[PDB]
């Protein structure tokens, strides 16, 4: 049994959403199904959920905010009627909650501003005698000036994990994001070993693949 | 039905014990509906515990719930690096006399040393592709260090640079249990071209004194 959340996007305040949970492997009349929410860097919040009989149940604070129903044999639908800037969070459908048959979805990413859309710019941070240490060189990349979250970043088309740091994006005065992503590699490899960051911007259609190499 | 956790943040040495409270404004369904759960960065929470004591399969025998009624804890014993997560409570309730679920606010899970560690810290020049675009970002990246504290300073021509600078820091490594930080200093191309020396100066209770790195532009 899985469970999978979509339709998380940015929109401006006061434009109303709809999120769909869809369910494999069982059946709705069987089971109870729950939302829950997380702001950045907050809490876990229930939202509502629909019962084995079909009867909704919501939080006293998400009553009239959000409208849970059964939209299909194999889908609930969450719609966010009026959304404000506090609405953006991840949001997590589950069967249960509670009990043994509790199954959690990864949760899709809701933002709410009148910020506009824009795609990253990717820079090299070039491994150099100033990023070496003991045998052990640093390079990585610099992901700037983007909107809305996510970005995703591998090393090598994901073949290189250990010793790689993505740092959490910070919000510039401008409005927009900007992250690091950084690997440590023996220094010995800088002139055999290729190293790609791989950047994925969703929201702006944006991908890129940047060789990171010494600085000449 | 509100759920308070104490304390909010929590600090274990590795083979401690760390004792996480969660008090129910009500009392729970059948007085054990209280489940426990764990979240580790970027993922979903997992379920470890429900009926306030029960484990979920295949979770370590390490955590122990316990409680019923209004006032539950959860017991991690022999704490291990990867115990780093933030914890919450969840109680549940009979739908028509109460809110069906609520979540405790959250219990951070840190794991703590005796021993520090310093940061290698490393500085990268902006890029020439940046350059062109008319902007200078500077980066300066403190890896793999304990405890958490540490002070960053940009100095360009050796002036205390305040207000044209951010940075970000790494949840704690689940297996080596230290921090990392990127500092990144922004200037436009016309003020980075003014100057000759940038540095960034490292303090933290690992290094004797401060350590910095540096490079001159251009050269």
Known sequence: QSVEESGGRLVTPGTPLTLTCTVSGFSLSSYPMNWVRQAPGKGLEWIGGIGTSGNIWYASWAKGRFIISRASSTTVDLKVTSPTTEDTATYFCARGLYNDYTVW?????????????????????????????????????????????????????????????????????????????????????????????????????????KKVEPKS | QVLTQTPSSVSAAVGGTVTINCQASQSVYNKNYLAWYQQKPGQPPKRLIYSASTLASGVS????????????????????????????????????????????????????????????????????????????????????????????????????????????????????????????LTLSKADYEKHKVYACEVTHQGLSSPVTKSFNRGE
């Open chain 2, 61 to 184: 025998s390490r955590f122990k719930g316990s409680g019923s009624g209004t006032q539950f804890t959860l017991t991690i014993s022999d704490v291990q690096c990867d115990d780093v997560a933030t914890y919450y409570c969840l109680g549940s309730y009979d739908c028509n006399r109460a809110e069906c679920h609520a979540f405790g606010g959250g219990t951070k899970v840190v794991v703590e040393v005796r021993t520090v560690a310093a940061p290698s810290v490393f500085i990268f020049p902006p890029s020439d592709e940046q350059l062109k675009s008319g902007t200078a970002s500077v980066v300066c990246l403190l890896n793999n260090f304990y405890p958490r504290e540490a002070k960053v300073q940009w100095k360009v021509d050796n002036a205390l640079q305040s207000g044209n600078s951010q940075e970000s820091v790494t949840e704690q490594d689940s297996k080596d249990s230290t921090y990392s930080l990127s500092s990144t």
């Open chain 1, 105 to 209: 979805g990864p949760g899709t990413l809701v933002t709410v501003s009148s910020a506009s859309t824009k795609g990253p710019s990717v820079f090299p941070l070039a491994p150099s005698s100033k990023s070496t240490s003991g045998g052990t060189a640093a390079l990585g990349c610099l992901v700037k000036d983007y909107f809305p979250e996510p970005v995703t970043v591998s090393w090598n088309s994901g073949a290189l994990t250990s010793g790689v740091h993505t740092f959490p994006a910070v919000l510039q005065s401008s409005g927009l994001y900007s992250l690091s992503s950084v690997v440590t590699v023996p220094s010995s490899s800088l002139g055999t070993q290729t190293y790609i960051c791989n950047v994925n911007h969703k929201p702006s259609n944006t991908k890129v693949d």
